[PDB]
Amino acid sequence: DYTVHIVDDEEPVRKSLAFMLTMNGFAVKMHQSAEAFLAFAPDVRNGVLVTDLRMPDMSGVELLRNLGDLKINIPSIVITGHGDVPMAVEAMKAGAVDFIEKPFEDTVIIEAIERASEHLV
């Protein structure tokens, strides 16, 4: 019993990330944007964080940077872009438990979340 908190700058859409995770029995809680999650983060208990924000303006590396400046224990999975190396390297340098180069299928994302749900209890 743990929650997967997603954070994407993209419109809902019946078929993308959250709805997949929930079709697979996962407790999912979506968030409109980084600042929105940043402003709720203090109130999270037993959850895993899965970022994924494309635009370099507000990257997932900075969202991890800010969570570190509050001393929050949220095991994260920073989804990156196809062939984006420095970012995926920067994320592991920001406390990230893993990364996932896009595209990706259910399997890998589900697996990785479970390996993150270890760093909890």
Side-chain angles (χ1 to χ4, degrees), residues 14 16-44 46-53:
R14 211 277 163 84
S16 238
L17 202 65
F19 202 33
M20 182 260 284
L21 285 177
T22 153
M23 277 185 273
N24 284 266
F26 279 80
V28 202
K29 166 128 189 66
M30 198 181 323
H31 296 248
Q32 278 191 31
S33 199
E35 197 100 29
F37 179 82
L38 285 162
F40 180 59
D43 274 272
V44 176
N46 289 8
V48 207
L49 162 58
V50 184
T51 73
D52 164 47
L53 318 156

Side-chain angles (χ1 to χ4, degrees), residues 16-44 46-53 55-56 58-64 66-70 72 74-106:
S16 238
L17 202 65
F19 202 33
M20 182 260 284
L21 285 177
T22 153
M23 277 185 273
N24 284 266
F26 279 80
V28 202
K29 166 128 189 66
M30 198 181 323
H31 296 248
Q32 278 191 31
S33 199
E35 197 100 29
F37 179 82
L38 285 162
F40 180 59
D43 274 272
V44 176
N46 289 8
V48 207
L49 162 58
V50 184
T51 73
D52 164 47
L53 318 156
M55 64 229 248
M58 193 307 134
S59 69
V61 179
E62 286 128 344
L63 171 63
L64 288 172
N66 287 107
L67 302 170
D69 282 314
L70 274 44
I72 306 188
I74 290 185
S76 33
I77 324 304
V78 181
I79 303 183
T80 66
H82 189 110
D84 193 348
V85 197
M87 148 63 123
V89 175
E90 258 304 309
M92 302 287 309
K93 196 145 202 160
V97 178
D98 207 47
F99 76 76
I100 298 287
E101 194 203 301
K102 292 197 297 300
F104 60 78
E105 79 288 82
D106 339 307

